[PDB]
Amino acid sequence: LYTVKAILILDNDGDRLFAKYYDDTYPSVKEQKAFEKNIFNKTHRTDSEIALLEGLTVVYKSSIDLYFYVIGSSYENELMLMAVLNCLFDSLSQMLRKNVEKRALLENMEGLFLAVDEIVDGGVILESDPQQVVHRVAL
Amino acid sequence: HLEKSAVLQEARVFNETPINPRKCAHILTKILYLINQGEHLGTTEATEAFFAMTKLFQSNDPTLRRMCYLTIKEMSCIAEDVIIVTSSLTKDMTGKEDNYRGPAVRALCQITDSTMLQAVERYMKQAIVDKVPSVSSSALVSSLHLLKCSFDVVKRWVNEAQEAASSDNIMVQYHALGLLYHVRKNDRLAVSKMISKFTRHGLKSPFAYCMMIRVASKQLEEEDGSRDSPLFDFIESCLRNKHEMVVYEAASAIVNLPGCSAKELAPAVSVLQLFCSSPKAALRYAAVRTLNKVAMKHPSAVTACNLDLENLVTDSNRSIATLAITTLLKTGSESSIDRLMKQISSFMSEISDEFKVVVVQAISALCQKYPRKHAVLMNFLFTMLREEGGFEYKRAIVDCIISIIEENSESKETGLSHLCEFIEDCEFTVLATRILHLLGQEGPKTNNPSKYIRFIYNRVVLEHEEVRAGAVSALAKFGAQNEEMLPSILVLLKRCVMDDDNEVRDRATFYLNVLEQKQKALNAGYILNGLTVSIPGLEKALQQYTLEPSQPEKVAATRQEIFQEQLAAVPEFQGLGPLFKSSPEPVALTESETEYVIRCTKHTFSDHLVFQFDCTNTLNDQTLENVTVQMEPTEAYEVLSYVPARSLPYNQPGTCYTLVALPTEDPTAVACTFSCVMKFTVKDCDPNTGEIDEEGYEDEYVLEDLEVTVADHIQKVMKVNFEAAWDEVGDEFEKEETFTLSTIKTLEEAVGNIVKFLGMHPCERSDKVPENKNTHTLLLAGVFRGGHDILVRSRLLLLDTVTMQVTARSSEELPVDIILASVG
Amino acid sequence: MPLRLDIKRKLTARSDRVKSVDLHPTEPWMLASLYNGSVCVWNHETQTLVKTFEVCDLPVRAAKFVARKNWVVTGADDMQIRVFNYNTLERVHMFEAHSDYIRCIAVHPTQPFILTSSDDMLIKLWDWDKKWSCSQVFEGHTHYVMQIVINPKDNNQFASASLDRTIKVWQLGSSSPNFTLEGHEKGVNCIDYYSGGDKPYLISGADDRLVKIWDYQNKTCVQTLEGHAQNVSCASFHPELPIIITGSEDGTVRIWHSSTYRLESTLNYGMERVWCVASLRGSNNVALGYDEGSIIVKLGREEPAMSMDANGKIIWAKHSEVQQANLKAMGDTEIKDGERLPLAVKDMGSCEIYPQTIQHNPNGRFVVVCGDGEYIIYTAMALRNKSFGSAQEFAWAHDSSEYAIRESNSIVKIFKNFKEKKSFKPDFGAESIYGGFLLGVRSVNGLAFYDWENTELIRRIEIQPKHIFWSDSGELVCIATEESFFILKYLSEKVLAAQETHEGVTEDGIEDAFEVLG
């Protein structure tokens, strides 16, 4: 039981606006931020549903001032990961009552924290239905 | 954003009277923020905040409940007296609504430990069966965590877990099947039953397929009892649902290790399954690939090729381009290498920085991995040296040089020499070390060492200590290997450079003094070619693969020797007949990893047989001591001694032996059957590998019989001329008996049966007899135990069945009698 | 989902609408209370009616035994509970239990109490020892109190079901219900507890066609049971077996597995309108009250499935340190013959099917779990899937690397190395199988023995067996029979001439090939 390695929603530098680690491989801030900077540097300023970083398929999207991440295994493809990443974007948008930017996330830090935990649970994909997550969470 | 101290502190008011759901929920949000933003909690304040929050569980608000679940999990480990929160979580967990249901099970189960396991079970059973994915999936992941604390509680849930498995809802199923596989496992077979039930089904759950593919990927033919095929009717071997990841995972395993063979609607040996998905968008990345494939990656490679090769060349996007190189690499092979190398050459042009280093490494690495000649590898290694000039490193000097001395060395030094012309001190410590090491070691007569020396001499001045030190020591070895060289050593070493710097001086003082002053017994000894400091494997090629898209020794050779060694350690067996031979037909008494694994071999000596029983107690509940394998011979054999296996704990082999004396007058065979029973003392054990209880009971385990054949007594040989040998061994021990082999209708099978049974190789290759000939003479030879030859002559008559008069002669009465009896 | 069952009609009796059915607290008798104004009790083991009591001339809705006094309590539309001695045949006491007829009575053997539930919306307590004085009156229910049951974890607690959409848990001490459960949505006909020392459960039945399971500890509704396709008259929990037995006014009774609530059986009788259910607390008898009579029914699973090899893996399924679904057990203990030996279990690997029968190999190399028309073979002590096969029944023979199976095509099958043997296929038909070397197959009022050599009829023994077991030489057989027991001789040579010749008739055999030794 494992698909998603970690979820990060990063500003346009790779610094932690947010990350919640569905791996046990980053718990300390220094390394959680390093990871975040690492994934953001590869993936950014080339938007696609694919990136390969650290031998893992990284699926990412972007907004005005954020890049949104799911990191998962590379034995899969973008599309499986993408379903998590689409939930992540979508659910935060509907939850916060505003599209994902740094402003929406900061506006409601609580909605963001709770919403992401419903999407991924210890690296298993707990939820992937944006609607379900949003009802499930209370602001 | 926040300060961890202030927020951890103000949380302590909850512990008293104030509960205020708004204030506390905010304070909680702040805790989650401190972690999220990236901060570390202080333990005293954390411990205090944790005891305080539990009061807050009284007020049931969905946002406050939510805050409470995330905060207790994060604060659980950095907190004390957490046990109080279990009750509050159960209270929450039974409360209907997904907000409570799912999030509570997860928070509760994380905090829950084997004592507490029992409490959560009613609520857990109710939460697992849900086709509402949140409650069920959270409960299913929760159960996975709980397998650690206590296995047994979780196991009972297998029925609720299975119930979820029957959903086609993606989460409920993914979680249900995945978890089940982990849970119910006590043997392979019970998990396999769980998998077969879902297996025939065309799911609309890609995640379940994926998690299951992995379980499935190996051939399973015991799914739900048994079945006649490795069959997976869920995409693993089938292609019921198309979706490029699932399709890729499935297609690479099935092709050359069938999960099932190819179907018209589901390729599974053929290369196709990947390829139909292959032209695509970003999605293509899974689709385009390969791995394994029938019979090679190469017929496969051609399909996909348009896609991988155009993206790889065109896209100087890192994200696309990486998928394109990995995809090229995958469609690759030995054959593909011509194509792969041009592409990789081309690739650096798109992304050129580290990627440059990687392509010049890749083209060499691929040439070493997939052979386009070892020479070409060196020539590519020159191109790597040329292009980068510094992203070669120290590990490269050792790897290039070791690799080079397989064939390239004279050339490599020379190439290196040219390469050294580059750049005087920006070329790095490493290239200078490579030309230096190679010029030292080869001692060029292929080119004049004077260019090399002149090139190295300049480099040393302005480059690091390690090379300058390297240069003096190399020179010294260079002196010892070649006499000629000594004059250059002296001009170089007197200089302030190759000696008299710092490290360079110390090494030099030593190396110099040994060459200059001393005998050079030492210097001579020291150069064995002038080799590197270590010989590793070929490091580059694996490194390169990931990086781009970002002494077994033996004594025995014969069964008799290995056994003889095992026997020899024990005295009795070599003291009481020495071993002629040990069986060429050792029989395993009891099957592997059941109750016992016992393999017995019968060993023949001059007048004895020793039976070595290698005994394993694979009994999980026991550990054994004082174990022996007891024996009842079915003929006149004396059982002299038993040697015990000292201990046989769980899954640990031990050996026990029975020594018996052979008859040497027996009129009937030494082909004989012994009934084996192992007897032992059991002390109770908790399965690990071993552990004994303070007291225990006697127990016995029955074993299979050991059969001793004439084949064990005789070692086979053929003779150039049977007739002489046949007379020579002893016609004075001659006895003749006539047999009918009615179950063998030709001579060729007949000769084979006497040859196998007796352990005699028929002379002159007499196992091949003129097909269906009326008379034939079969010549047998071999040596019997004690070291005496046994020859047997069987004059075959072929009617419709085989009749033979078998006459045997031997240097003893016993082989003759033994052969004659065993055959019939 | 599979479960060891075997529904059997222990005794039937025809009478006007029986509202209540009971098993005698400690006796093998079942009492049914009828609308004949009579309550009648019959001991459905010897099929003797022990006694009848004429409580009233108007329906007696409830009757139960207060076994200690050797008395029976009845509540009838006299609005009285009248007490009688069931061996001295006279009316012990007469008292007015309620202002309305008494639907159910519950007896506390440990206390002098009966509480009775009546449709005067009240449940009242009477103490038999005081000569049926009113100990306590419970006021809580605002509607017709259909049924009362005593909780077996605290007899001081009972629950009463009323058509007020609740089942209220009350304590004796407290007139009022100390907490209320809202167990159903269209009134609660019945309340029952799921019996035991560690089972806090309620069930509610309602006329919304549905029976609901509730956990009284957690207070949530565990699941909803489809019940019946018409108003569920009553629902109860079986104690031993994981099922719920419900009855409906459609004349149907259904049994539901209490692990997934999938239909185990539907039973009709030609008696119809099934008003009540009750279950024996010592388990495997349930009795159900109908319009046209009462029935006492006997449920299956009477005996355990297990086998002892020579490896000390004695394997069972269910039980302690073993799960039902998976397989385990070991027994390496040899403590004194005079007492029951510990479980002594050691853990054993994978399973994939349910154990209809689960058995170790008689000399220890195989394990077989049989279930659902399939057999799965697992390895003796490693439990990796060895083999698979078909088996509605599986029996190891004597050979135990040859076994008999009923594949249920009307020929008894032999599987050898867990692979089917078609050199074995009876020239009898089949109705059933006995293992051992000469396979006994029962058909056409005969027991026929078949060869594992050419499947010809060796002999037919004219008393059918319970079992055939054959010795481990295969010349001597032990036949379990209604006759009592046979030992028969199979003369091997006589069989070889007879079988080849096929002088043994298709369905009658040759009476020489086998001979009756004793």
UniProtKB/Swiss-Prot annotation, chain A:
Q: Where are the transmembrane segments?
A: none
Q: What is its main location?
A: cytoplasm
- One GO-annotated biological process of the protein: intracellular protein transport
Q: Which branch of life, at top level?
A: Eukaryota
Protein transport: present as a keyword of the record?
A: yes
- How does the record say this protein sits in the membrane? Peripheral membrane protein
Q: Does the keyword Transferase apply?
A: no
Location(s), subcellular: Cytoplasm; Golgi apparatus membrane; Cytoplasmic vesicle, COPI-coated vesicle membrane
Q: What keywords are annotated for this sequence in UniProt?
A: Acetylation, Cytoplasm, Cytoplasmic vesicle, ER-Golgi transport, Golgi apparatus, Membrane, Protein transport, Transport
**Can you quote a single GO CC term?**
Golgi membrane
Query: Could you say which protein family the record assigns here?
Result: Belongs to the adaptor complexes small subunit family.
Quaternary state and partners of this protein? Oligomeric complex that consists of at least the alpha, beta, beta', gamma, delta, epsilon and zeta subunits.
Question: Per its database record, what is this protein's job?
Answer: The coatomer is a cytosolic protein complex that binds to dilysine motifs and reversibly associates with Golgi non-clathrin-coated vesicles, which further mediate biosynthetic protein transport from the ER, via the Golgi up to the trans Golgi network. Coatomer complex is required for budding from Golgi membranes, and is essential for the retrograde Golgi-to-ER transport of dilysine-tagged proteins. The zeta subunit may be involved in regulating the coat assembly and, hence, the rate of biosynthetic protein transport due to its association-dissociation properties with the coatomer complex.
| Name of the featured protein | Coatomer subunit zeta-1
| Source organism of the structure | Mus musculus (Mouse)
Q: What is the lineage of its organism?
A: Eukaryota, Metazoa, Chordata, Craniata, Vertebrata
Swiss-Prot record, chain B:
What Pfam family is a match, any one? Answer: Adaptin_N
Q: Which residues form a coiled coil?
A: none
Sample GO molecular function, one term: structural molecule activity
Question: Does the record carry Protein transport as a key word?
Answer: yes
Region feature Interaction with ZNF289/ARFGAP2, mapped onto this chain: 559-824
Q: Where in the cell is it found?
A: Cytoplasm, Cytosol; Golgi apparatus membrane; Cytoplasmic vesicle, COPI-coated vesicle membrane
Q: Which GO terms describe its biological process?
A: establishment of Golgi localization; intracellular protein transport; organelle transport along microtubule; vesicle-mediated transport
Which keywords fit this entry according to its UniProt record?
A: Cytoplasm, Cytoplasmic vesicle, ER-Golgi transport, Golgi apparatus, Membrane, Phosphoprotein, Protein transport, Repeat, Transport
Task performed by this protein: The coatomer is a cytosolic protein complex that binds to dilysine motifs and reversibly associates with Golgi non-clathrin-coated vesicles, which further mediate biosynthetic protein transport from the ER, via the Golgi up to the trans Golgi network. Coatomer complex is required for budding from Golgi membranes, and is essential for the retrograde Golgi-to-ER transport of dilysine-tagged proteins.
Name the family the entry cites: Belongs to the COPG family.
* Quaternary context: Oligomeric complex that consists of at least the alpha, beta, beta', gamma, delta, epsilon and zeta subunits. Interacts with ZNF289/ARFGAP2 through its C-terminal appendage domain. Interacts with EGFR upon EGF treatment; interaction is essential for regulation of EGF-dependent nuclear transport of EGFR by retrograde trafficking from the Golgi to the ER. The coatomer interacts with KDEL receptors; the interaction is important for retrograde trafficking of KDEL-bearing proteins from the Golgi to the endoplasmic reticulum. Interacts with COPB1. Interacts with TMED10 (via C-terminus).
Name-wise, this protein is: Coatomer subunit gamma-1
Q: Which source organism? A: Mus musculus (Mouse)
Classification of source organism: Eukaryota, Metazoa, Chordata, Craniata, Vertebrata
Curated annotation (Swiss-Prot), chain C:
Result of knocking out the encoding gene: The knockout of the gene results in early embryonic lethality with no viable embryos recovered at 12.5 dpc.
Reply yes or no: does the keyword Nucleus apply.
no
Q: Where are the WD repeats?
A: 13-52, 55-94, 97-136, 140-180, 183-224, 227-266, 350-388, 390-425
Q: Which GO terms describe its biological process?
A: intra-Golgi vesicle-mediated transport; intracellular protein transport; retrograde vesicle-mediated transport, Golgi to endoplasmic reticulum
Keywords, comma-separated and alphabetical: Acetylation, Coiled coil, Cytoplasm, Cytoplasmic vesicle, ER-Golgi transport, Golgi apparatus, Membrane, Phosphoprotein, Protein transport, Repeat, Transport, WD repeat
Its subcellular locations are:
Cytoplasm, Cytosol; Golgi apparatus membrane; Cytoplasmic vesicle, COPI-coated vesicle membrane
Gene Ontology molecular functions: structural molecule activity
The family note in this entry says: Belongs to the WD repeat COPB2 family.
* Quaternary structure and partners: Oligomeric complex that consists of at least the alpha, beta, beta', gamma, delta, epsilon and zeta subunits. Probably interacts with PEX11A. Interacts with SCYL1. Interacts with JAGN1.
Give the protein name, as stated in the record. Answer: Coatomer subunit beta'
Protein encoded by which gene: Copb2
